[PDB]
Symmetry: D2
Subunit: 268 residues, 4 copies
């Protein structure tokens, strides 16, 4: 009698046990969902990490820049879940921007090849995944992607914020296509989460100034949030994704749900 009882849901984006997608997968299993996982490049690592989830789940390789992987994806999922069965949910929790497009490297100094790779992985791939998977989704289904509010510019995030602006636009178009299948498409805009990479950035991995700036941004977030914000806890974010994967928001599509403590609704 979980929120997601009987649902078959694909979850991309697990790389470590601090990945937002690891917590999305954990909560969805706690709520009765049957998962198929996708991983990029380091499949041995990802299998070992995902062994710590409450239930075993098949793991498929998916590099979103690889056209072959995308073309075979629905067939591979169908074999993992059994012929005649379809998915009820898809989670996109994939993002990347080269170091030249984030941190202390000046905004104007990111070469376009680097920005293009970041926008491919972070924004275009949301459409790629929907194209691949809508033919094997049931009516009433739900596609969810991870967003970080790009409405205002911020220090250090730089071209990653541009990629999120493109992602929000992509989501509105995916909703139009997904609608033909009786399927919803939405993003969850999360507050900052202390993943391994984010901890490294605050520790100065992309320059001292960028680290300082991101730390300040984190502190302001909790201060602004009327219910507070705990950057070490991805669970409220994971629960929000599961809310969208459920049947409890059946008239919301092309949209953005903010799991940020309410910080974006306050100026100070």
């Amino acid at each position: 009698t979980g929120l997601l009882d009987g649902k078959r849901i694909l979850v991309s984006g697990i790389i470590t046990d601090s990945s937002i997608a690891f917590h999305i997968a954990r909560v969805a299993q706690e709520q009765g969902a049957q998962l198929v996982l996708t991983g990029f490049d380091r499949l041995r690592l990802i299998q070992r990490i995902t062994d710590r989830l409450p239930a075993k789940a098949p793991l498929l390789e998916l590099d979103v820049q690889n056209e072959e992987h995308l073309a075979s994806l629905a067939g591979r999922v169908t074999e993992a879940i059994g012929a005649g069965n379809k998915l009820d949910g898809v989670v996109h929790s994939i993002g990347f921007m080269p170091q030249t497009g984030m941190g202390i490297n000046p905004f104007f100094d990111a070469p376009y090849a680097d920005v293009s790779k970041g926008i491919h992985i972070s924004a275009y791939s949301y459409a790629s995944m929907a194209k691949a998977l809508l033919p094997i989704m049931n009516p009433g289904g739900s596609i969810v992607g991870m967003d970080f509010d790009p409405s205002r510019a911020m220090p250090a995030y730089n071209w990653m914020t541009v990629a999120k602006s493109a992602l929000e636009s992509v989501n509105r178009f995916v909703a139009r296509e997904a609608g033909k299948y009786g399927v919803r498409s939405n993003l969850v805009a999360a507050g900052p989460i202390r993943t391994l990479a984010m901890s490294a950035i605050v520790g100065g991995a992309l320059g001292e100034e960028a680290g300082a700036q991101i730390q300040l941004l984190e502190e302001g977030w909790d201060q602004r949030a009327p219910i507070g914000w705990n950057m070490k806890d991805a669970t409220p974010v994971a629960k929000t994704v599961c809310a969208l994967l459920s049947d409890w928001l059946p008239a919301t599509t092309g949209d953005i749900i903010y799991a940020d403590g309410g910080a974006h609704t306050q100026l100070l």
Copy 2:
């Protein structure tokens, strides 16, 4: 094992069996919630209407313009739910604007006394209710109000749209206060719902031109909505309110969730 098992929730705004609040109450009871209802003025009528809900619920009188009603409200609720028990949820589903502030009466011709009454009932009362009820709400609790997207002007809605703009602002402030109690505050922006009053307006009760305009607005809404919009079905709206009343969006406050078929995310 419902979504709202064990929760005690106050629901205002029932006047007929087509009231959005009637469907909110029905769905919340189907999901295990124990309700306290509030009604305005025609309490005999409201009791008879609410007899059709799946479970019996105490009905309290509440005129949001009446300071005495608001001052006694927490005590009356506490006696209905039993001393030592508190509310987990509050639903504001209250709206009013005099006929001079809607329909074919020119926008410039609404007297301020009429606009003020409409803003009192439709916007200020969201703060009034929160003031009255936060002292008897549990941590983890949720306050939800009903909104109609006022970001762009529209024909006929006129000063009611202005009241909704004020309501959205009020909600962001209520979230700051509610946060001190561990309580969330959010609005659900619904698409148009064919309540008795809305059917009457399309039938020309506020002038022929206003009727025509609202009919066109309804038709465009379903056309824009990537998953469609059924104005005769309040259930998707009710489910969305219950989503916010649950523990599944624990990091969303001061915010607006759109239960509109995705229509606001599309231009045509």
Copy 3:
């Protein structure tokens, strides 16, 4: 050969030489406009203040809560500018909220009578003025009101922020009506300006906590603004209003132009 050569423009809202409207009037006269001024209550004071403008201008009494003043206003303006002449511009620079609706008085403690008076003066009056003056405006004309960005809640501003949210909504409706006359309606959202009242508030006139909060808000504004923000200089704001009064933004209506140093476009 000024920006506003040959234009006849009404300017409300002068009370001291630090009033934003004083600087709007000064810049418009420097740019060739012929003004009619309106003042509330302390007409002797206002006449003495306005004697410091570059050119003499007729001063008319206007209490926006007074129905008689509003009904006679067009006739009084026509006699000041001469029969057969019409206005090309109207400036609304009027705002008020009782002390119970701003500062350290808790948000929930503002009585509705006080909030209603504030919304009357600050929001409804924008429509009142347009109703009164559109019949004596020329095609190509411009109505401009003063706004403070209410998209996010902030400390101390409280019900004044709610009034601004209502004002933004009112402006979109006024644009629909003004359009019938070939007239534009827009708001200028200014950054914080150190008027006499604002200096007093920072000095603690509405409580110490509110003062502290507003000071912090001012400091953050200049820090966020990519071109900086000088709260002691109303001239950039005045120039922006004159831009809207000119023929140089002829396809902008129902809209908001931000004269805030770009602060609202940045998170930190």
Copy 4:
């Protein structure tokens, strides 16, 4: 005594006499500006077109995808305007998306190589141009780019709308960098303009369905616009760009000014 007297302004984007940039250049010259023009690929054609402007202007070659052109650009401009002189204004009026990313080709069928080229030319190039030209701009200067409101998805525009979403994000970052030079960065969001390409699209050049959809969008725009919208007249758009190039909006940066008849502020 024009609006732009004494200013030196670079204008990109002229290809035909229906180019929005042709009208921007014409109005800026009528207002006293001294121009430097940039053109892509068909320089013989562009020279002949630009011979119809009120004043002669030097024409420089600029392919925004060509790193060499961008690296030599400031030097070439300096030789055209004379050593010791700098620019006061820069106009980006450059946009492109391959046919696979617009029209009736399904959204999911645009290959990433095509989308990437479109985002390079339409969004990244706004940053490229600013990088190249800020070192030769005067304090008080202004960078302006052309936008089409991408806040909601629309039929046929598809990946071009995604590129505009990215452009709006880029503009907020460019404003931060431009601020260091005392320079503003803003976009003008225009309503639809019947350029040669747009006429061709309505005539069915990108498929019949896409043509039909764009025609409907155009008709709705004028209907929504409180002051109307004339798609055959680029002059109101050009005047708006010149407003931003002037000293009359000195506190607006990282922002978007809508020259759309007010259509985006209205639902119907």
